Design a protein around this ligand. Structure first.
Ligand SMILES: Nc1ncnc2c1ncn2[C@@H]1O[C@H](COP(=O)(O)OP(=O)(O)OP(=O)(O)O)[C@@H](O)[C@H]1O
Ligand SMILES: NCCc1ccc(S(=O)(=O)F)cc1
Lengths: 418, 426
């Protein structure tokens, strides 16, 4: 009791009913139904049928499908090279290797201060009426892996999204050209609830197939886990948080260092919380988070990512010499601690006055303006290469006095400072 | 415009212009936004007024008050050696020095894994109906600075609480004994909203007074800052304001080590996400989270574990500053890393078990799964009134790492293993 397996609907079935399943390999399972849809059935292990399966092929990239893997782009049915199982119990393709290499997001708030690393669970922490989806959109079309031998793919999964802003994605993905490396799953709010739950399992497995059996680094974007939750919320329990676990388990470097599975799940605070109680998704926050701040949003900054509450637990693995540029951490640390103080001094100005501040504190204050204005703010079609990211850093690091530059080495300064 | 709290000496009207004498004597302009019975809120852009003053004295510590410094414990008025500005424009007593030494909070999930350092701003991220208020009380009772020659004190601050909770706090703080080190500021939801927003200013001005002028390490606790936002929101006839984010900055400025190093002001604000959202939108309190945050998770509450602090989301940025070798204990960091990873792994394997069954698991994988179970049970779970010393905290960490095999213990130096692992420890 506890787990779930998603099975093909061969016959109409009831509730709490004894039935059989023909697994991906074989191991026959004793289970009971929980809920049903039109083609999919959920069964808790501990008539005769078989698991719902994903048509795994390199022909998945370039095509758009629904949560159950049904086509949406008007095109044909996906021709399956293999017939893999949804819940990632097929190969067990992950290694006992720590996430190491670097992935470029294009956004400097991430790439600079909270670097994303090949195989990481870096969620975006957000709320309603915030541009999180449009950040995820920007990642999908701008993401790449500078240097790596392996091809790069993106798996974009949407859950509980409305028609009007479903066409948003459909248009964006095609009119950018970044479809030819991206498998896109869409799940409508109007779509069956059981189809929502299976969506990320279809998304992750598609990436697992690609990363392992075609040795490529794959980045998965799950837009709003909260919406995944509200479908599970309504499903009718002692699986509440362990189900979440089965989703954040599927992250890291695959067997044979060539490929990778990386995640950016969006977690956002709901429209209503009392009538629809939202679980703490804190289980997903283990390798850091990317905080989106309403404060930066209200002063007209995109992307409104507050770097301070944000971090990447594995950044130090994917930065510096060879991976990026050796002065990466040197700049990051300085930019962080720099912006950190300038921001706190913004309180000190309100207390004592603009004309009562130290000249030291004023150049720190103004730095916080510059960081938000010139570094944090980038266009929606601005794909800042890691060099620029670091360079824009240096440009604003010139404003604060040199003898106040935190802990950097002279060699890092004298060479890379204008 | 930024709001300044003014001593009511004269009747005032809305939008009227005033000239406030400062803590030193630099007269400044502004206009009236709102007022209480005896306090006036003024935004800086003929009448001259004085700033609100705190009845500052060593003679505090023991008495409970209102957010205006008005006695609640039936005792006398506070006899002030000096009445200094509450807006912080009295001293600026903070030094250009990074928070260093350690604070014994008594809780493992904080002390061990997310160590609290003197002068830090480490919030407790919570939600509706979580034990956050209980954690605060436990910290207040237990907190200490071992070894440190500076006298330790705790300043407690309540915003928009209820009478039930007011009796919960007052009663505890008295009988537990932690009052002869505590200045308690209590403000309940029926005390004018004007006094609610002044409450943290008072608490911080008391903290600033003790730390600087009396060589003190002071710990400030602001309970539920989402209620403070609620008072900011519903302010005057003149969705959240513009000065809202800027106003919080006047609070999270006031923390750190005092001039001359002989004292500090440490900050534990409570940030709890509310019930509704279309009514009461959630504020961007991310202005506070800069030096880490402590996360209390429902998952652990629902399983019946106090304190329900999840260490994986939790963090302290400046932990390294007050930990190990005559600070806590040399091994400390080598234990934290190994516990964190061992819990992170286990936590993951609670999923893999639901994918391929309990039996269909690896030998090593089963051990980390069981570790993740022991972590919550014996390292996370601690009594409401047990003050675990760092030595205890870490030795518990050793009694838990024994369950894991030695060849898997990697985030730790071997010179630490042969010295401290119960199977070796000669
Ligand atoms: N001279 C300095 N060089 C580099 N970093 C410094 C210096 N002085 C302070 N800092 C940084 O500032 C932080 C001090 O924390 P504290 O909360 O006391 O100040 P703050 O609120 O960041 O800034 P302020 O008090 O000026 O508004 C430390 O994390 C430290 O790294
Ligand atoms: N709504 C109460 C606001 C208020 C309260 C008191 C005054 S005063 O006349 O006493 F100065 C003025 C305005």
């Amino acid at each position: 009791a506890g787990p779930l397996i998603f099975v093909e609907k061969t016959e109409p079935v009831g509730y709490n009913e004894i039935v059989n399943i023909k697994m991906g390999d074989g191991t026959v399972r004793r289970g009971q139904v929980l809920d049903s849809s039109a083609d999919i059935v959920v069964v808790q292990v501990f008539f005769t049928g078989e698991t719902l399966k994903l048509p795994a092929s390199v022909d998945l990239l370039g095509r758009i499908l629904s949560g159950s893997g049904e086509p949406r782009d008007g095109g044909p049915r996906i021709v399956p090279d293999q017939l893999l199982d949804i819940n990632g119990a097929a190969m067990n393709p992950y290694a006992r290797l720590p996430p190491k290499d670097f992935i470029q997001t294009g956004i400097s708030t991430i790439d600079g201060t909270n670097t994303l690393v090949r195989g990481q669970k870096l969620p975006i922490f957000s709320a309603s009426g915030l541009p999180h989806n449009e950040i995820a959109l920007q990642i999908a079309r701008q993401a790449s892996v500078p240097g790596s031998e392996s091809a790069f793919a993106v798996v974009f999964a949407a859950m509980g999204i409305t028609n009007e802003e479903a066409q948003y994605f459909m248009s964006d993905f095609e009119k950018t050209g970044a479809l030819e490396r991206a498998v896109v799953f869409l799940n409508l709010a109007d779509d069956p609830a059981v189809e929502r739950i299976v969506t990320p399992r279809m998304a992750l497995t598609a990436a697992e197939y690609l990363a392992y059996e075609h040795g490529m680094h794959v980045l998965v974007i799950l837009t709003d886990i909260t919406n995944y939750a509200e479908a599970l919320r309504q499903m009718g329990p002692g699986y509440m948080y362990t189900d979440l676990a089965t989703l954040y388990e599927r992250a890291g470097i695959v067997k044979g260092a060539k490929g990778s599975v990386t995640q950016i799940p969006i977690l956002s605070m709901p429209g209503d919380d009392i009538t629809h109680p939202i679980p703490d998704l804190s289980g997903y926050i283990t390798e850091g988070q990317i905080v989106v701040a309403r404060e930066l949003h209200r002063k007209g900054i995109y992307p409104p990512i507050n770097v301070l509450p944000s971090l990447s637990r594995l950044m130090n693995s994917g930065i510096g010499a060879g991976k990026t540029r050796e002065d990466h951490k040197a700049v990051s640390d300085q930019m962080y601690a720099g912006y950190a103080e300038g921001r706190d001094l913004r309180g000190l100005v309100a207390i004592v006055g603009k004309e009562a501040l130290s000249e030291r504190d004023t150049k720190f204050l103004e730095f916080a303006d510059l960081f938000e204005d010139k570094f944090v703010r980038q266009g929606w079609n601005e794909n800042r290469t890691i060099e620029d990211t670091l360079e824009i850093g240096w440009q604003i690091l010139t404003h604060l006095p040199e003898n106040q530059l935190g802990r950097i080495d002279n060699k890092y300064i004298q060479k890379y400072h204008p």
